[PDB]
Amino acid sequence: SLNSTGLAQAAINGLNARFYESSNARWSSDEPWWISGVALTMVIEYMRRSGSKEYLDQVEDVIEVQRQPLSWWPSGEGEFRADATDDTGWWALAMVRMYDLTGNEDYLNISIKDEAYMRQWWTDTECGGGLYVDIQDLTYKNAIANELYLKLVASLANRAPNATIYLDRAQQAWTWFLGSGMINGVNLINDGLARDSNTGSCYNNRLPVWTYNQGVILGALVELYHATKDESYLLSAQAIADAVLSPSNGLTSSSGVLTETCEGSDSCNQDQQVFKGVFALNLAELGDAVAGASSDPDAGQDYREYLDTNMQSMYANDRSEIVPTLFDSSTGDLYDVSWSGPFRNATMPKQASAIGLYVANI
Ligand SMILES: OC[C@H]1O[C@@H](O)[C@H](O)[C@@H](O)[C@@H]1O
Ligand SMILES: OC[C@H]1O[C@@H](O)[C@H](O)[C@@H](O)[C@@H]1O
Ligand SMILES: OC[C@H]1O[C@@H](O)[C@H](O)[C@@H](O)[C@@H]1O
Numbered sequence: 001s002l003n004s005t006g007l008a009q010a011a012i013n014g015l016n017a018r019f020y021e022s023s024n025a026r027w028s029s030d031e032p033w034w035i036s037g038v039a040l041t042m043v044i045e046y047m048r049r050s051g052s053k054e055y056l057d058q059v060e061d062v063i064e065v066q067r068q069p070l071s072w073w074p075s076g077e078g079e080f081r082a083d084a085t086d087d088t089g090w091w092a093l094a095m096v097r098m099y100d101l102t103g104n105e106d107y108l109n110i111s112i113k114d115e116a117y118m119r120q121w122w123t124d125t126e127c128g129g130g131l132y133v134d135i136q137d138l139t140y141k142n143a144i145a146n147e148l149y150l151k152l153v154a155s156l157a158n159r160a161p162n163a164t165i166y167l168d169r170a171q172q173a174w175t176w177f178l179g180s181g182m183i184n185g186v187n188l189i190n191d192g193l194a195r196d197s198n199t200g201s202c203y204n205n206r207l208p209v210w211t212y213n214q215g216v217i218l219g220a221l222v223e224l225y226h227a228t229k230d231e232s233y234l235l236s237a238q239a240i241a242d243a244v245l246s247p248s249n250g251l252t253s254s255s256g257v258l259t260e261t262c263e264g265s266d267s268c269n270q271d272q273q274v275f276k277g278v279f280a281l282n283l284a285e286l287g288d289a290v291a292g293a294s295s296d297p298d299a300g301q302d303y304r305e306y307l308d309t310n311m312q313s314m315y316a317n318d319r320s321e322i323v324p325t326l327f328d329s330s331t332g333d334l335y336d337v338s339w340s341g342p343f344r345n346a347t348m349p350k351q352a353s354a355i356g357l358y359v360a361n362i
Pocket of ligand 2: 133191
């Protein structure tokens with residue numbers, strides 16, 4: 001059979017060999033900055049699950065440089081406070097996992113600063129709650145920025161000293177999210193909310209169902225379950241995951257492979273190329289929590305076999321090994337966007353999603 005730990009290492013090595021920039025402490029500066037934060041999450045989570053510490057020096061290097069005040073948003077004063085609330089949220093959650101891996105309170109302190117910075121754009125006057133994604137414009141309350149923020153306060157409710165205020169915020173944020181309408185009739189989450197012209201009421205904007213908007217919410221509900229031991233949080237998360245796994249909903253192919261809607265038209269952009277790996281790792285979080293909340297041996301078996309099925313398909317159809325030279329000894333694996341499709345090229349967002357699926361099976 002396949003060993004997920006060794007393949008995640010080969011994928012991380014391929015990510016480093018092709019896309020890591022030593023002089024910048026960052027992967028692929030020609031790609032979105034927030035995807036470097038997702039890549040850091042993948043590498044950190046690989047270490048926690050595999051017990052290795054093989055990239056810890058590299059991770060601390062990336063952290064220390066990306067803490068600095070961003071050149072495109074100096075008013076954030078660094079600590080990953082960017083010009084978008086979801087950009088900040090990706091690095092904030094990576095710092096929660098960095099704290100989980102090392103126990104260094106420094107990384108939890110970043111997460112706390114990030115929560116307070118993100119909360120500045122939570123608003124009760126439009127849509128009765130939720131925060132904006134575009135800090136500069138304040139025109140869009142979308143699913144991903146509010147899912148990241150919800151997972152952040154739910155994580156801090158389990159780790160921070162003033163844990164009670166973060167629990168009240170997480171419980172209040174989930175209540176708003178559930179009543180927002182972004183969760184539709186088949187228990188899937190559209191992209192965000194639109195605002196009525198005359199009335200000012202908000203409603204599901206019916207924009208595409210992206211895989212990473214069905215994943216981050218699972219981790220948030222798992223963290224809310226850990227903070228409350230209320231299994232109804234796991235039940236809501238399971239209904240969202242079951243909808244993704246149902247081939248009738250168009251996200252799981254007839255082969256049982258997770259498929260982004262943009263893969264059909266071959267039009268997945270730099271953002272959408274990383275979505276699947278985010279869902280896979282969050283589904284592994286849901287599976288681990290489900291198996292720990294009951295005594296049935298097959299508890300969470302469907303989520304684990306789904307991750308295994310997607311691993312083997314992408315292992316077999318989406319992989320390409322880098323060829324070593326007389327000068328470069330680097331070895332590893334590269335991956336394209338489609339887990340059940342051909343390998344044409346490899347980009348950093350595609351590679352980061354790749355690692356997330358392997359780490360989800362460790
Ligand atoms: O505004 C979004 C930001 O995205 C990042 O990936 C880029 O590196 C910045 O130059 C840009 O300002
Ligand atoms: O690619 C899809 C993503 O595009 C971004 O510009 C939007 O802010 C997100 O809400 C959306 O999920
Ligand atoms: O790009 C997605 C669009 O979604 C709409 O629901 C929002 O009202 C816009 O502000 C946003 O730009």
